[PDB]
Write a protein that binds this ligand. Structure first.
Ligand SMILES: [Mg+2]
Ligand SMILES: [Zn+2]
Lengths: 158, 141, 47, 39, 150, 183, 37, 55, 53
RNA sequence: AAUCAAAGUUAUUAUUAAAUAAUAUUGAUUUUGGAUGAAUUUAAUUUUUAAUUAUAUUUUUGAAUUUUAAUUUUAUUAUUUUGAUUUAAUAUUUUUAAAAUAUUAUAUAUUUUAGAUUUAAAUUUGUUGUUUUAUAUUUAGUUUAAUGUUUAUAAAUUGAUAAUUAAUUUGUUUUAUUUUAAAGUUUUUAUGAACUGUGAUUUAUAGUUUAUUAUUUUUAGUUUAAUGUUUAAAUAUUUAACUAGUGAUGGCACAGUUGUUCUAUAUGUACCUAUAAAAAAUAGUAAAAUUAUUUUAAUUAAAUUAAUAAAUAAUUAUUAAACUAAUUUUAUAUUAAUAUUAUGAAAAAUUUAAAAAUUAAUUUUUUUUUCUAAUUUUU
RNA sequence: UAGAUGUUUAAUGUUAAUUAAUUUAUUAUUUUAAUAUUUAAUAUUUGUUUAUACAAAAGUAACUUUUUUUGAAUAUAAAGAAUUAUUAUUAUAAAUAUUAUUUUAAAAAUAUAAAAAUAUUGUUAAUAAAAUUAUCAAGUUUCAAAAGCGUUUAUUAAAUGCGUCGGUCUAAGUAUUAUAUUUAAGAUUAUUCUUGUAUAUAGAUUUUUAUUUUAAUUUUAUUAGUAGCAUAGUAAUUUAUUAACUGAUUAUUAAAGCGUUCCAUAGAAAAUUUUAAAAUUAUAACAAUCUAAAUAAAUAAUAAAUUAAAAUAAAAAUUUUAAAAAAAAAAAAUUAAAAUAGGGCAAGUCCUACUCUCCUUUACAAAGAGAACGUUUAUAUGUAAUUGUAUGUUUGAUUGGGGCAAUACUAUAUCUAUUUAUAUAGAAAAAGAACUAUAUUUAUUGAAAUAAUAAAAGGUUCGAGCAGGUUAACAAGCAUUAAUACUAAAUGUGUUUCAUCGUCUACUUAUUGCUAAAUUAU
């Protein structure tokens, strides 16, 4: 059967990112970019974005909302209490121009690239036209299973 | 969720506009034949004929076999009873007069004198009370 | 009789008979209850 | 066990008593299963 | 609507009461005649006294064998009475369903063949018994489950 | 209807006093007081029953993946009755089975009766064929097969998330097998 | 003393609402076989 | 009961020496020299010292 | 207010000891029923004249 | 001993409801058939999932009613892409949960004791608080339009033709509403023969009296009695009686103006008034109710009639009226128009009647601003 | 003070153009629905000790890994009374398991009775069919009334059942047969006479009685008869008993038994006689099990109480009030200790019944088809027909318009008589006219208890009435009101009544009530 009403919507309250399109319109915030919190807590705290979890529109803004972490450890290693910057929302964070250093609105544009024709969706400020590209992710260096991988030259044999 | 929280989620019959009555219903015909209402404004007798004028005549008094012939008023205690069914047309409107017994000539057209009937050529200016319509000599059903 | 011991019931209970199944076969078919069109008669047995 | 409620008519006149004979209202929206067949 | 019969008012109304009569409907009771059933006899009453063959025998499309797992509206009333009631054979042992977790006729392995008295089953069709026949690559060109990276 | 002659007319030889079928005349169907519950099997006990009644959609959802249904015309019924029909061809050559082995009976304790789990629709003689031709197992004299209601539980949210059901098949190998675990 | 209040009477009142498949099987012309014409 | 009782009816309950003596009486006690636990007189422990010489 | 007959105009929430016939003149006049319960209605006493009226 | 008047704040969590909108619609919640089909069939000239701009006619005299509106022309069966719009509604759960004044031989809370008492509503048909409802808290709880500003105009009459010196208003057409709760019923079709009827269904698991296979009977579940009396039970405990069924708790079979009946108007799923379903039946004709303090003109009546009270007078009421001799320089509620579910008058004065009261009678028929003053005294 | 001679809301309350103290004043004495109390210091609850079968329905709150077979497949512990409750679910089979849920220091009642002298029915409507017992658990007899042995929702001269008999049936069942009934077997007998249904019938009705149905009012012969027998009654006699409203006998005009009567008659219900354990009167006589407290925490009911007592008057009522004047646990006198039955009236509906009311009606008859059979008509209207009426007022009669009775009139008391019967269809077509209705005049028959009912009030049993006991004082059919029958048992009470001074009889018949009459004397 279904739940008790405020626990019915507690199920909506606890996991609000399960509704589709809870992820915002084409992504604008990536790791490391210039950012500061304007609303909520500590207005005017300039930080770099450490890590981003997308599906829920959440970001680890460094040096802001650093929440004391209760790290759980085994008998092997002794636990520690070190604080980490807690996943903080983005609806209350904006961008400061890496050059101008003032609160800028960062939005997408399509730009014909130079020597390549991707027309990749490029972020641009609405005041400075700061052409900020989308950062390219990294292929993990130490990835790969040694004993259970068919080699590409051995797996692409047409 | 509020009115009954389960009686209003599962659905029963929904009610709609309720049709009206024949809004000259209360000029019933046991007056449109028995009486006739005479009089100037603000005094309308309902004059009615004699009581004993068809049943037993032989032997009744000589000068009372004729009191049955005059258009006597009906006593006002009944005027107000019968004319009560006619007042109800728009109550609480202290300045509309009661419906009349017979249909006065100007109100019959008052129905078709309305801004919505101006496009019904038939049934306008009196077509019911008109003489019977004349048709093509070939008219046939 | 003023005493219904109600223990003479309860012995050799009847099958469950799940009458919702025949109630369903009616709707899962065009026919209503087979109104006295048949209504029935006891059919013979092989014995 | 069942009942037609109409009562089996003579084998010669197979239909007496249509439900319309009684001024019955059987709109599909009123009692549901209504709409007759002789129609 | 009792009179959906061939209209014959002064003559005798053939069959009138019999098994095969008209004016009784189509999806009626009184159709014991129609005992002809595609499912083999032995799977609706066991091949022997112990009700051996009894059950619901799903079958593979290709297999010519016929099983009694029907889903026609006329046949589900008995296919549930197998899954929830089960059969109490007249020999004393309860058949196809005897305990708690009611079987899933549609997740049975397919009927492979009619039972025989001498052995158990004449395996009438083996084309229903899958024999996974993938060659084991021990000769050359080794293939791990998933591929390498750039 | 309520008053007047139409009230008394019931005495004046009128059985059926009609209900006012001009008032509710908003024509949208009510629903009966013995209201039906939806077709979803609410139960998640061990006596959960398979619904035999065939649903319309389940056929349509079958076609659209068998052959592009609204767009690609059907394969001729001869091919569909043939072992060369793709889902009969994707099966005869690319089986899809999950014969998972339970280790709690084949761990450090030696066993002659290692237990498996096989999909509910793998009969005995197929489990033989399977281990024989895929895992080289060549010594299986008797297999012993149950059927278990898939595990059930309540997730932290609260919906009863019952896993699929399976089929314990305690095979009985000749020479016992074992697994070592060095700590 | 009715019987069977249990779960099978709790499914068989919920799963049987499932609408069976419908195919307009139109009447078979038994006596007038059309293909033998 | 053909009437509900106001508190002044429920309160008369607490005046007789039946309520008082049943609920509202403190028990006379003292410290068992052997067990150091509070104790009434005439009652002892399940213990050799407490059982041979009544503390 | 409730213009109860035979008793002025009463307030709402007032006393309904005397509205025995206001609760009975709110239902409305009998519909389809002779207004005159006894005494041979004055219409029936007078004679039909001029068959149409 | 006895009283003693007494605590208004949880704390903490977020995108449903309802109407509306005139674009889709072969039956929502696994994978027909899986023999090869015969088994997955709902269709017919009637107010129908089709929903219609008048007051005149005409009519069993009395619940019956008005005809294309522009001929495919738009009144038409409806949502995603503004948390889809709008306006009305607003929560539901988790855990919150508090408090210090009046005697000392007794009527009822005021500090200064004494004075003080219908609890209300109805019902009172003045058989005049007439034996009815209410434990308390909070929430929810009942629909007659209090208004007429310039285009603009109405108004009668015969039975009928007609006649209209016959004298005269108003109105840019005013309509819609009509209490609330409550039956037994009543009709319209769907479900039920697991209880119980009857149909059918079992061909020999204990005792015994008698010559007898018939027949007395062991007889622990059942014609009685106690207990129980919201009980361990919406029928159980103990117990009396009875008990001999080759003819019967039982395959499936009969269903509601009807089945069944060794017939009792009995039963056909724990009140047979079947259940289930769909209505707005009636209930003003002594049922229960009908929500807003501080106001600003009074009263009773009692007759014609009733296959016995919805109707009439008279009263009351809402709205409105004009100053005819009589007097003082007194004093005067008279009316019109509508609204109106009523038959019976304390103490007298008398009058019918075995009244043993009823009946006639006809004058009564109480709503206190506060401080104060006063002429009628349980001598 | 304060407009005035008493019943139709006051609102720019964030300027519904709001923006940090709006301090919102507006809240229905009952209704349901949700909570909370009272009953409740409680009613229930309470876990100390152990006599074995296996099926199927039924469940699935359900854990899992465990070694089923040599079958493919398939599935093996758990119900129903709302519950973990009264509760062996008896499909089978078996017979020695040291299988294992029951608080506790008392006497009242009460459920209950071990034990125990007399007495034996005097108790009571009535003793005797009334648990178990190792003290081994059983009354005998007579008479009168009474059939079959099956079967029943208030459990039986209920209804079955065999035979006989009446009727029907030779193109679906065997006419010593099977339908359709009435009776009841067995044994005696089964009487007199017909006005209607039925049959037969002849265009039909109308007529019309071989047998059958129903009838016999003085049928009344046989036969039993104060009897389940309309009153009269306790029938009058006889017994029987101390006492005979018992019961049995004789006969015998029995309010109107009667031939399907009567006899015969067995376990039944009575009446004797008699015996007898239930603790039957006398009669009272705890051995047993059923604490408090500690714990868990329900129910009816609930306007309030500081009054409640008590006495007295009352006035409409039973008294309850008003007034005066006082002054913890058992029991059931009062509050409503009760439920719910018992009335009767009103409007409403229900259900059944028949010479008179009326349809849907399937039968009978006519006609039409060269009548090949189905339909349609016409005339008919059936209780087979399920519609509606069957009153109102005073109590059972009356219904009209007058008059006399103080220009009062309940029907009071008396009488009169062209005092007139309005409308609508028909009838009379000029001005003139007929018919009929509770005579103000709306409807289309008359009857029932149907276990009648639902929504209401209101009485049979009374602070006041009425008619039939030696004539007259008295049982007691209408003005109130959950008081919810008479009597008995038990248990009280205030009176009042001659000289101390006064009020305890027990029985028989019937349980009606109160007498009769037996015990000396009552
Ligand atoms: Mg409220
Ligand atoms: Zn100690």
């Amino acid at each position: 059967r279904d739940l008790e009403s405020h626990q019915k919507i507690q199920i909506a309250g606890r996991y609000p990112y399960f509704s589709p399109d809870y992820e915002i319109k084409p992504w604008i915030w990536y790791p490391g970019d210039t950012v500061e919190v304007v609303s909520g807590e500590g207005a005017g705290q300039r930080g770099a974005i450490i890590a981003v979890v997308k599906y829920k529109n959440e970001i680890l803004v460094q040096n802001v909302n650093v929440q004391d972490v209760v790290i759980p450890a085994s008998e092997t290693r002794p636990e520690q209490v070190v604080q980490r910057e807690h996943p903080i929302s983005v609806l209350r964070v904006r961008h400061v121009d890496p050059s101008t250093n003032q609160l800028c609105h960062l939005e997408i544009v399509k730009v014909r690239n130079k020597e390549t024709g991707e027309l990749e969706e490029r972020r641009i400020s609405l005041e400075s036209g700061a052409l900020l590209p989308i950062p390219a992710p990294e292929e993990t260096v130490e990835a790969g299973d040694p004993l259970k991988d068919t080699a590409i030259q051995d797996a692409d044999e047409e | 969720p509020k009115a009954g929280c389960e009686e209003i989620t599962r659905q029963g019959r929904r009610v709609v506009l309720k049709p009206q009555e024949y809004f000259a219903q209360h000029r019933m015909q046991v007056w449109q034949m028995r009486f006739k209402e005479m009089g100037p404004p603000f005094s309308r007798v309902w004059v009615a004929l004699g009581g004993k004028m068809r049943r037993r005549r032989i032997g009744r008094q000589i000068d009372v076999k004729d009191m049955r012939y005059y258009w006597r008023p009906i006593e006002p205690q009944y005027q107000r009873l019968y004319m009560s069914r006619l007042r109800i047309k728009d109550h609480s409107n202290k300045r509309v007069q009661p419906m009349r017994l017979r249909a006065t000539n100007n109100d019959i057209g008052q129905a078709s004198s309305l801004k919505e009937w101006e496009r019904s050529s038939d049934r306008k200016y009196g077509a019911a009370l008109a003489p019977p319509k004349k048709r093509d000599f070939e008219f046939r059903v | 009789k003023s005493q219904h011991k109600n223990v003479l019931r309860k012995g050799r209970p009847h099958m469950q008979k799940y009458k919702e199944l025949n109630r369903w076969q009616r709707e899962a078919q065009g026919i209503t209850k087979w109104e006295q069109g048949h209504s029935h008669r006891p059919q013979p047995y092989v014995e | 066990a069942a009942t037609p409620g109409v009562g089996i008519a003579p084998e010669t006149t197979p239909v007496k008593y249509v439900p319309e004979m009684l001024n019955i209202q059987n709109a599909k929206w009123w009692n549901g299963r209504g709409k007759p067949v002789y129609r | 609507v009792f009179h959906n019969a061939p209209s014959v008012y002064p003559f005798t109304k053939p069959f009138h009461d019999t098994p095969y009569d008209q004016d009784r409907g189509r999806f009626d009771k009184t159709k014991n005649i129609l005992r002809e059933n595609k499912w083999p006899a032995w799977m609706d009453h066991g091949a022997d006294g112990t009700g051996f063959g009894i059950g619901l025998n799903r079958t593979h499309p290709l297999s010519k064998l016929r099983g009694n797992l029907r889903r026609n509206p006329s046949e589900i009333p008995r296919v549930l009475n197998m899954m929830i009631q089960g059969v109490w054979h007249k020999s004393g042992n309860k058949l196809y369903f005897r305990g708690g977790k009611p079987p899933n006729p549609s997740t049975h392995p397919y009927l492979t063949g009619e039972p025989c008295p001498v052995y158990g089953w004449k395996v009438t069709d083996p084309g229903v018994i899958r024999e996974f026949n993938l060659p084991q690559p021990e000769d050359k060109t080794r293939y791990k489950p998933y591929v390498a990276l750039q | 209807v309520n008053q007047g002659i139409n009230l008394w007319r019931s005495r004046m030889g009128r059985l059926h006093k009609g209900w006012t079928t001009w008032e509710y005349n908003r024509d949208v169907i009510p629903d009966p007081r013995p209201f039906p519950e939806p077709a979803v099997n609410n139960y998640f006990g061990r006596s959960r029953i398979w619904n035999p009644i065939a649903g319309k959609i389940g056929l349509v959802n079958r076609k659209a993946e068998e052959w592009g249904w609204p767009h690609q015309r059907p394969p001729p019924t001869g091919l569909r009755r043939s072992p060369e029909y793709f889902p009969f061809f994707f099966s005869r050559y690319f089986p899809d089975v999950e014969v998972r082995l339970v280790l709690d009976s084949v761990l450090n304790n030696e066993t002659t009766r290692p237990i498996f789990h096989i999909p509910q629709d793998m009969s005995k003689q197929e489990l033989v064929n399977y281990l024989k031709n895929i895992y080289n197992i060549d010594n299986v004299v008797r297999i012993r097969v149950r059927n278990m209601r898939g595990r059930r539980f309540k997730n932290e949210v609260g919906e009863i998330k019952s896993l699929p059901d399976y089929k314990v098949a305690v095979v009985e190998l000749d020479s016992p097998v074992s697994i070592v675990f060095k700590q | 003393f009715k019987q069977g209040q249990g779960m099978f009477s709790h499914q068989l009142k919920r799963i049987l609402n499932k609408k069976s498949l419908h195919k307009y099987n139109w009447d078979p012309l038994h006596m007038y076989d059309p293909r033998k014409l | 009961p053909k009437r509900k009782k106001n508190p002044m009816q429920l309160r008369r309950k607490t005046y007789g020496l039946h309520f008082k003596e049943r609920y509202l009486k403190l028990e006379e006690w003292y410290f068992c020299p052997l067990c150091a636990e509070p104790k009434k007189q005439g009652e002892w422990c399940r213990r050799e010292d407490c059982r041979q010489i009544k503390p | 207010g409730h213009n109860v007959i035979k008793m002025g105009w009463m307030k709402i929430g007032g006393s309904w000891k005397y509205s025995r016939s206001y609760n009975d003149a709110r239902r409305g006049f009998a519909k389809g029923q002779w207004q005159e319960r006894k005494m041979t209605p004055r219409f029936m006493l007078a004679p039909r004249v001029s068959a149409g009226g």
